[PDB]
């Protein structure tokens, strides 16, 4: 067993390289993606922001949905920072929703466990929902906060 072994790891890949959060589409439109950031940078940096993700129909956007007329190029954005916490930034032309609740555009919001963001509101048939999966590993790391010392 040589080549087959390589395939086994293919399906069973060690997840948690440095993942911050995971975006999962429940409405079945966009493929699941994994948001990640540097722990050292997050732990060391506690001002302004560390690493933010942009989502939308734009190929530049960290998240590629498709091309919804209602949704904007970069419908929403997610920023990671604070004292070991995540933030959600809405950046849509029509607005970004959280569990049916519309939040203030370009506004910072505290992340939620298995939270969900709805977008494209205006038409019952033109709304798209997304789910946010927080990596428990990232949280556990912060709770322990390892020290970086040479030798």
């Amino acid at each position: 067993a040589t080549q087959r072994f390589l395939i086994e790891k293919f399906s069973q890949e060690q997840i948690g390289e440095n993942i911050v959060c995971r975006v999962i589409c429940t409405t079945g439109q966009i493929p699941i993606r994994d948001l990640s950031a540097d722990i050292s940078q997050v732990l060391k940096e506690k001002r302004s922001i560390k690493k933010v993700w942009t989502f939308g129909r734009n190929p530049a956007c960290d998240y590629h949905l498709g091309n919804i007329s209602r949704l904007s190029n970069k419908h929403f954005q997610i920023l990671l920072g604070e004292d070991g916490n995540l933030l959600l930034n809405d950046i849509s032309t029509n607005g970004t929703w959280l569990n049916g609740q519309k939040v203030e555009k370009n506004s910072n919001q505290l992340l939620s466990q298995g939270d969900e963001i709805t977008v494209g509101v205006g038409v019952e048939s033109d709304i798209l929902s997304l789910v946010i999966f927080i990596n428990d590993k990232f949280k556990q790391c912060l709770e322990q906060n390892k020290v970086d010392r040479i030798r």
């Binding site: 007329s69 209602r70 190029n73 032309t93 029509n94 205006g122 038409v123 033109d126």
Partner: peptide, 10 residues
């Protein structure tokens, strides 16, 4: 192609 503004209840 560009973003179109949806309706809004004032």
């Amino acid at each position: 192609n560009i973003t179109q503004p949806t309706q809004q209840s004032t």
